[PDB]
Amino acid sequence: MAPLTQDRIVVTALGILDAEGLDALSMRRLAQELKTGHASLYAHVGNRDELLDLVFDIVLTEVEVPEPEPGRWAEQVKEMCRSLRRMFLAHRDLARIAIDRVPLGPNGMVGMERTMNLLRSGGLHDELAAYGGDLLSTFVTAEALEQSSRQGREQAGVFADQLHGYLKSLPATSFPNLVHLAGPITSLDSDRRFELGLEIIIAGLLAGAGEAA
Amino acid sequence: APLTQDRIVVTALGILDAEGLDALSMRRLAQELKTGHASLYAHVGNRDELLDLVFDIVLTEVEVPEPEPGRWAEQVKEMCRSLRRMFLAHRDLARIAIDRVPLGPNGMVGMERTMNLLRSGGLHDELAAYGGDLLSTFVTAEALEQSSRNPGTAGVFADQLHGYLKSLPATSFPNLVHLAGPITSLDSDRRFELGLEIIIAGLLAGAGE
Numbered sequence: 279m280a281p282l283t284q285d286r287i288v289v290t291a292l293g294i295l296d297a298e299g300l301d302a303l304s305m306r307r308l309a310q311e312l313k314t315g316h317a318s319l320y321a322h323v324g325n326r327d328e329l330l331d332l333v334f335d336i337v338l339t340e341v342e343v344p345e346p347e348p349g350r351w352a353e354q355v356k357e358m359c360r361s362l363r364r365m366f367l368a369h370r371d372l373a374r375i376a377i378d379r380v381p382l383g384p385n386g387m388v389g390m391e392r393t394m395n396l397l398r399s400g401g402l403h404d405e406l407a408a409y410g411g412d413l414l415s416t417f418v419t420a421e422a423l424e425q426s427s428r429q430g431r432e433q434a435g436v437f438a439d440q441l442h443g444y445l446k447s448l449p450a451t452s453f454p455n456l457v458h459l460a461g462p463i464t465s466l467d468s469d470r471r472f473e474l475g476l477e478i479i480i481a482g483l484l485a486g487a488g489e490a491a
Numbered sequence: 492a493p494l495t496q497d498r499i500v501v502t503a504l505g506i507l508d509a510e511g512l513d514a515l516s517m518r519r520l521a522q523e524l525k526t527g528h529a530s531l532y533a534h535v536g537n538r539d540e541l542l543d544l545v546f547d548i549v550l551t552e553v554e555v556p557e558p559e560p561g562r563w564a565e566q567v568k569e570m571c572r573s574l575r576r577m578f579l580a581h582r583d584l585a586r587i588a589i590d591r592v593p594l595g596p597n598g599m600v601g602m603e604r605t606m607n608l609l610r611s612g613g614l615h616d617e618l619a620a621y622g623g624d625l626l627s628t629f630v631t632a633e634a635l636e637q638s639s640r641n642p643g644t645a646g647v648f649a650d651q652l653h654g655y656l657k658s659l660p661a662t663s664f665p666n667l668v669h670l671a672g673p674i675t676s677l678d679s680d681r682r683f684e685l686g687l688e689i690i691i692a693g694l695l696a697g698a699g700e
């Protein structure tokens with residue numbers, strides 16, 4: 279062991295995790311890479327759970343919640359989200375982690391704070407700015423999973439196409455809509471589906487917002 | 492006692508409700524029906540392809556209604572709530588969901604039914620196909636979250652995330668201080684109705700002229 283810290287340990291874990299995925303991450307695996315005994319490891323970071331939280335928190339430094347600006351709101355919200363997504367893309371299995379874990383931690387609440395600022399900044403009231411953030415982050419995760427599981431795109435490529443084949447060759451009299459919509463369902467264009475989900479939620483917010491009429 | 496795939500999955504779902512997903516091995520299920528891996532793998536295939544059918548059998552509890560003059564936005568919600576009750580009446584069912592497509596026979600009927608309703612409001616091809624997809628995710632996510640509160644059939648932990656957040660330095664964390672309640676604890680029935688409205692209105696803006 280060289281000078282071990284709760285940061286060199288984490289930067290190490292993540293290293294393995296990109297490389298090889300969630301299940302290859304174990305305590306014994308980790309302590310191996312770093313050239314140390316279980317003592318030093320369990321000291322800074324604990325069992326496997328705690329470790330994933332620390333892993334989660336550190337990569338978060340990557341996202342950016344911009345400071346509120348004169349009439350850029352909608353875009354400033356898209357920026358923010360599109361930023362968070364770019365994060366999930368680089369790092370294997372990170373979304374899997376996110377589903378059953380608290381959005382807590384240094385980065386975790388320096389992040390909520392700036393998320394709440396910007397939203398409330400849209401002339402949005404309490405309950406709606408609170409929940410709103412939940413829904414966005416919820417929205418962007420799900421998406422990131424969806425993409426997570428898409429050679430590369432050859433297995434998905436043909437599956438999608440064989441799905442697209444069955445749909446159109448379905449009978450028209452009993453299935454007018456699905457015959458009509460075989461593309462827009464099987465479309466494996468995540469980029470544009472993503473900008474859509476955003477357009478929608480956001481307008482749902484703005485509309486939600488100034489309801490006081 | 493003629494064994495059939497429908498009988499197989501009524502037992503696999505009967506133990507899933509009564510004991511819990513994590514305990515549904517192929518092993519267990521086989522014992523219950525007093526039958527070998529032979530006859531069980533003969534229909535349903537393996538643990539994973541079996542789930543698909545379990546999911547596809549229960550989706551029968553969802554009732555997408557026939558489109559009616561003036562009431563579009565209303566009809567959508569009824570559909571959205573009925574899905575949510577399905578997830579509410581069987582444990583772990585969401586966990587499964589967030590891994591699988593509704594390519595099942597059952598699944599396909601309601602995709603047609605749903606998309607018909609959505610396209611009745613003035614939703615151009617695209618809007619409507621993702622409108623649906625979008626709505627699916629939201630209701631799925633919610634129920635996973637609801638199930639995590641442990642009800643149906645913890646509020647100790649949450650209350651302790653309220654104290655904690657409220658107790659931050661007020662100047663460095665004003666927004667987090669002021670929103671302590673609505674973030675930590677929130678009635679589940681309230682959080683659903685909000686997102687439903689949000690998205691529906693969101694899709695409505697999408698329709699335009």
Ligand SMILES: C[C@H]1O[C@H](CC(=O)O)CC2=C1C(=O)c1c(O)c(-c3cc(O)c4c(c3O)C(=O)C3=C(C[C@@H](CC(=O)O)O[C@@H]3C)C4=O)cc(O)c1C2=O
Pocket residue numbers: 338339340341342343358362376377378379381382385386387388389390392393411412415416419632635636639
């Ligand atoms: C790291 C932190 O700051 C960076 C920028 C910086 O300051 O360096 C940007 C950022 C930071 C940050 O901490 C952050 C968040 O914590 C959240 C966020 C806030 C939340 O309140 C939540 C979630 C969130 O992602 C969830 O993913 C989820 C939930 C609830 C659960 C529900 C379930 O258990 O199934 O689902 C997912 C895991 C949630 O409540 C959403 C966000 O968009 C962000 C951010 O954008």
Ligand SMILES: C[C@H]1O[C@H](CC(=O)O)CC2=C1C(=O)c1c(O)c(-c3cc(O)c4c(c3O)C(=O)C3=C(C[C@@H](CC(=O)O)O[C@@H]3C)C4=O)cc(O)c1C2=O
Pocket residue numbers: 420423424550551552553554555570574588589590591592593597598599600601602604605623624627628631
């Ligand atoms: C069974 C079928 O018919 C009944 C009506 C009847 O039987 O008379 C009603 C109904 C039926 C039906 O099949 C149905 C659906 O298939 C869907 C649906 C449509 C979809 O397009 C999807 C999902 C869906 O549940 C997902 O759960 C999911 C995805 C994709 C993934 C992505 C992820 O979250 O990681 O998430 C889950 C697995 C999805 O695309 C959403 C729905 O609201 C419905 C329905 O309401």
